[model samples]
Target: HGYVSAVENGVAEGRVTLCKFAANGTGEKNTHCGAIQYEPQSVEGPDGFPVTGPRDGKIASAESALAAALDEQTADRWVKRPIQAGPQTFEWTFTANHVTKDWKYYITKPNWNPNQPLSRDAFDLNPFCVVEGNMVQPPKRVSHECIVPEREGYQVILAVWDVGDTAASFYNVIDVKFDG
Candidate 1:
């Protein structure tokens, strides 16, 4: 599914179309988002069927089932991975395999979920903005100022790379700093 701007925080909305798979690649049974109405619960059948759910699901059996379910639903799924547009910076290549399982049935962390967003926030002060620069056409260098009080007298030199196919490159450098 694509982005549903009308819904929660402009994130993508989709149905749980598949069953959950265990971490070791075993199939789970019966757990359905329909049962819990997508509110996050143990992913297991009501009658003791092995099922999986989100991380919060209690009940050891239910939790395992739910975990497997979440993984299965999020495994090998196709999703939209955006590349930020811009300068010389830290570049990261995101291949399909990096985001999905080998089987290609479900997706993992498909979009920006408010409930559990990416972990970039903890490492960088400004998590939203990054040095997303083009890979093909080398970005022009620019002077940048640090915003934090501790790094007031510091300057850093940042180098960027284009790790994707250059012919039709989507390679981007994001969440990086450049020395001015």
Candidate 2:
């Protein structure tokens, strides 16, 4: 299907950098975050099959999956920044944007271990925000604003884009520090 290729192309074109770090921490400045594949990281399913349990039923261990998802050069390093409490906006520009059913945003449980691979249990069951109905496709970018849960120190934010035409979804995980 168009799952892998579409997600890869989004990364290649830098369109998937929503709420994520810019390349080299300089040009094309965006948020500081990590990127991962749709299949194994997505909770909805992969290739049309439901993926439940830890790591979305992927064979790889959680640590292995996290390692695979991150860029080798910057895996150990993180761009630290402070996010204000209250409503925050997330935006993305898609070069090969697909028609999407909805967008879901989630954040890690308070004080989640940074050294460990992210898991379903690490996040709240309910999405912090959801965008559905008349979802837009293509052209360029899209944005949504939502209230950020009260948290401090380092935290992770996850974004899922559910594809309308396929049984696949794309993912982005963001690393951020929250401050009042």
Which numbered prediction scores highest in TM-score against the true structure? 2
- Which of the numbered candidates is closest to the native, going by highest lDDT? 2
User: For candidate 2, lDDT tens digit of each residue in 49-78?
Assistant: 114422541311222343243422122445
Q: Residue 178 in candidate 2 has what lDDT? A: 76
Task: Give Cα distance to truth, residue 4, candidate 1, Å.
Answer: 12
Off-target runs (Cα >4 Å) in candidate 2 are: 1-67, 71-76, 133-139
What tens-digit string does per-residue lDDT give for candidate 1 at 1-180? 000111212111112211221111222222443333232222222221112221222221233332332322222221221212232122121212111111001111223222332222212222222333343332221222222212211111111121223211111111111232
Backbone clashes for every candidate come to 15, 3
- Per-candidate TM equals 0.18, 0.64
lDDT of each: 0.21, 0.49
In TM-score terms, candidate 2 sits at: 0.64
Error of 1 at 175 (Å): 18
